[PDB]
Amino acid sequence: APAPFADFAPPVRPQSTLRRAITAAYRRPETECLPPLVEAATQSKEIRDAAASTARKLIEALRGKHSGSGVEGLVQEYSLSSQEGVALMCLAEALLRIPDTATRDALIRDKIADGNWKSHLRSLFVNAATWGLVVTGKLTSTVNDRSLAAALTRLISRCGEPVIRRGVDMAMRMMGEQFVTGETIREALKRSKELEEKGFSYSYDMLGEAATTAADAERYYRDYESAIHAIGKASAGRGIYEGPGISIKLSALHPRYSRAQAARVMGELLPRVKALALLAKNYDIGLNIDAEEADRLELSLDLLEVLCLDGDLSGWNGMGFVVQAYGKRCPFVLDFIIDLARRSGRRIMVRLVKGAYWDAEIKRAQLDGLADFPVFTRKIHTDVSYIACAAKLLAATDVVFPQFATHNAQTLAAIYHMAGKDFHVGKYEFQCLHGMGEPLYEEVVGRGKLDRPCRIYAPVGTHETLLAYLVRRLLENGANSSFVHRINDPKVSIDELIADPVEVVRAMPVVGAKHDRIALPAELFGDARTNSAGLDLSNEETLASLTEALRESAAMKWTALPQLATGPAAGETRTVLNPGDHRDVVGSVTETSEEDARRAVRLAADAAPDWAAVPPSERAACLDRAAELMQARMPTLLGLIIREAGKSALNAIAEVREAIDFLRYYAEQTRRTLGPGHGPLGPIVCISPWNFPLAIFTGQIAAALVAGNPVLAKPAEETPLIAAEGVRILREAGIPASALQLLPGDGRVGAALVAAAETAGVMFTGSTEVARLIQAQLADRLSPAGRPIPLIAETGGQNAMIVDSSALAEQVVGDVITSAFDSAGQRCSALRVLCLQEDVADRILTMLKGALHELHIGRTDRLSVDVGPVITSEAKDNIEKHIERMRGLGRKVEQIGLASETGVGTFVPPTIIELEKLSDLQREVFGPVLHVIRYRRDDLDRLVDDVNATGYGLTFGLHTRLDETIAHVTSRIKAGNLYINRNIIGAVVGVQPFGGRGLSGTGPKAGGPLYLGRLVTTAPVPPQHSSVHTDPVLLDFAKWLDGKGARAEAEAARNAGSSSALGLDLELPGPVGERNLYTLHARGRILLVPATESGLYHQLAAALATGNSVAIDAASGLQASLKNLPQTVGLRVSWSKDWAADGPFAGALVEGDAERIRAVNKAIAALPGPLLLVQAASSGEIARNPDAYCLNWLVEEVSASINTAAAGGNASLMAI
Ligand SMILES: Cc1cc2c(cc1C)N([C@H]1CCCS1)c1c([nH]c(=O)[nH]c1=O)N2C[C@H](O)[C@H](O)[C@H](O)COP(=O)(O)OP(=O)(O)OC[C@H]1O[C@@H](n2cnc3c(N)ncnc32)[C@H](O)[C@@H]1O
């Protein structure tokens, strides 16, 4: 049995002083990074004046020679709107997918120009976001395909064949000659002769990036290898400076290129790069390693170090390496590289760039709650950093070859003059991008200009391949701060363009201040609350500190005892074992006797007045203190969750963050709402699951406590230790022992607590079956006021993702792998059914299976583990029986092989099962088991039906670029948490309030604004909770009431119409690159059980005002009270003799005395399907209290999270 965490995340090599200086700068405050950069970048007045004159001369040349884009001339010539321009280019792209040039011409002449283009040519507009950038300079995340179809029809009917021909020729020039140097390396090489004769050189990029499978990594490898041969053959001995080179991306060459997989990267990726470098060495060409995301920077240094020290590569100086000046570590990376160049004796080619991932780095740091960004946040800071880093490189030209890649004429001029008067080919060079930098560098290369060489970075690939880096380049070029946008911008003067960024930064009030409009991750929510803080598992200092803290957590004698108001209780004690290795004992639990569970409820009842008397803000302060304690203790809490719950470090971090967020969110929501009139329910029984043994545990308990209720906390029998630690933290933060009692044990303890007479409310997260058993036990009971005992139950889902042929396969696969198998599929939100449009199903399925086999399954105390065990042997048996049944029915089953070491724990291999029909799946399988179905596009609406038909409604994912498909699917799906173009897991508190409908639970949403209101007897008005919309059937009903003489009910109906929040439509603060929406809809059909005519009218007003239809109990005998309804109201009303036949319902309204309410409540609990949120009132309550039926519980909350960076960039952030 290996010692826990003994091999958690050992670094590839001991970190040298130079390496440690890199890591120390990773997220250094921006005000601290800039002053040394300002100083390093300072040049003399004489130099600065000379540089401005040279920069001015270059810009005047740029602005002086022929502008006027081909696309712009085409739009002008045919008077095209923007949408027609985009639509036309999409049409041209599609026409060019036809290889036979004559076949394309006949299609244009005989079918396209004549009329219905739809009949012949996967949406035509899949890539319209890219063409929209080409046409308008603006990036839209998704495609209004109905607008584009209308515009394409309009333009063809107006201008016919001539405009189509002009569009085809225009796209042919852009895609074949402007976006790529060539479609193949041999073609790109041919076209490079022209500019090589003028003094340029070339570096070829085989547009290849992010392998998701081993097969794709091998394909990219053989692409690079064949390109190296063709470039080396063409180089023909010209050497690494005058001759052409290649650029590679390491992420192309291995599907798991990350720090977490460092051992595989060094064992499997490194030999591949060495083999390519050996080939580049034989031909004597440059081989440059491109720079990618910030969390790959230091890992790439380990590969660079081995390669530069590998004697088999000696005698060749062509190895090159990109460093990104927008990165805070850039100068320290250069120190390391320059030192490595001295040690190895290799003159490393150093390409200095600004950086291509800025948008994505902002979003990622915010999502992960890290201390700061790894890039600058003001564009001018990157320019200073670049110039400062150029000074460092120019002082080391004897040992490195600097390559200044930039299209910024001011940056160029500053370096040109910084480099001084002595030059020779091989001292340094400039670089630019094909089709972008040649205007500028035609003013640089050659004896008649500045006589400095420029290497052109030449993308290579087919039209399909090119439509990826096309968005990045066009977005980076068209950003409001980008030099190439500003030079084209006529309002921008040359004086603005040649302004020295070094002197502008120096003269600022606070040097290096963060961008005003970008929130640090900790400040995402502004004044409302402090974001929880995460941990960077790519940071070697973090990994080293965490290794120590995780080991120490495994030395602790964790215990959980029955913690009653009076003190710890005795009981039967047993060990708690690591589900990944039963030999690893995590702690001991003493479980609660049934007698002591009943005693705990009585003590909670006795204590309830004293806890209720603590002012709401002071109850909130306890939560905020507990959040602080959990944040401080996160490393230790991580280690407990890893070993007790079988979770990976990554997921444990997110769980602790989520518990912190719950505490701070409910504290803020309390300070926003609760006053004296919002009295507590009383003792609340909180029953929690094992799969989020701290987050969901803490969330339910914190909400009940801060709402003024004492809590009986019953954690899952599998995970009592982290629960005991959470209660200990909450008590330490100030929750009295009598207000929070811990009762470890199995479902018998849970049931004793639920049955106890003083139990005033139940919060349950777990299986639907147990929730249904709890509901049935509570149906027998009423509160002191004679009202039903509230149950909040969140019960999981049968969650689907629909993927159409417009989605990007690699994005889909990554989101599918994460959604289905993260946490061994033990999330209620996990992806269970992937639905693939038939025309892309085979390709996506192939990549999915390939990505499945790259997952590492094992005991979770190693960073390299992706998927841990399932929680118990019984779970493992249940899941495996489902798999084998599917296999026995002939379904295709893909499974990864498990290592022998998993035998000591309870593991299920991640599994893909291909189904014929969604109806093949008849139960939630709570494991790492993804089911895949395929669908024809015309059957999309039927498929949405099939998804809804399961009766569940928790999470739902949609991958598509097409607005019509988004509007269709999101308006027809019935689920609580929607996700567009992203994964469907890890809902964030206050951002994606979490909770569903149907078989997925009662609501209200955890981490949402209606949650606390369910835990008090009089619900407060939540923040932002209102709507200006009035249900029109409600209004028709109120007029009908006035017509029948029911004046008071008519007034009460209109009041409900105004009070309803139906139609609330909010955007919630969150990370950049994402839009997080929160809306209130009708729940569905409300079961009405009235007793009196007036009671029925009030019930009907309540249901209609919230958008619902109704089924009214025919046994009430009140049919004569609804004679002559307007058809609009009639459409919403049905009468039910057999309630179970007319379901499912989405809620219920009951009128009666205490005995009648109990009888109806019991009958309702026996209705099959969803647990119904039931509201009850006496006739007198209805007459006295306008809120007798609370409208909070008659609407349905919906969260939708849309990844607006999905098209390849952040448009809003590019205007920053
Ligand atoms: C010419 C060239 C360029 C690259 C490459 C080769 C060659 C020959 N390789 C390539 C290999 C694979 C990807 S391409 C390469 C790159 N990139 C990469 O990451 N890895 C790589 O390997 N690039 C892209 C550059 O990093 C950079 O984005 C682009 O060139 C714009 O810089 P400019 O011409 O100085 O414009 P300019 O002076 O306009 O600056 C634009 C840049 O400023 C930065 N910026 C914008 N807003 C900012 C803000 N609010 N705060 C801070 N900074 C901000 C950002 O980096 C942006 O790109």
Ligand SMILES: NC(=O)C1=CN([C@@H]2O[C@H](COP(=O)(O)OP(=O)(O)OC[C@H]3O[C@@H](n4cnc5c(N)ncnc54)[C@H](O)[C@@H]3O)[C@@H](O)[C@H]2O)C=CC1
């Ligand atoms: N919605 C979610 O996030 C969760 C869903 N589940 C579902 O439940 C299955 C897990 O099996 P279990 O873990 O046994 O879930 P379970 O729902 O039985 O356990 C849930 C909680 O209820 C308690 N409990 C069990 N029977 C009870 C009863 N009769 N009265 C009162 N409390 C009772 C348990 O002790 C635990 O604290 C999974 O396969 C999955 O389908 C389980 C965990 C989380």
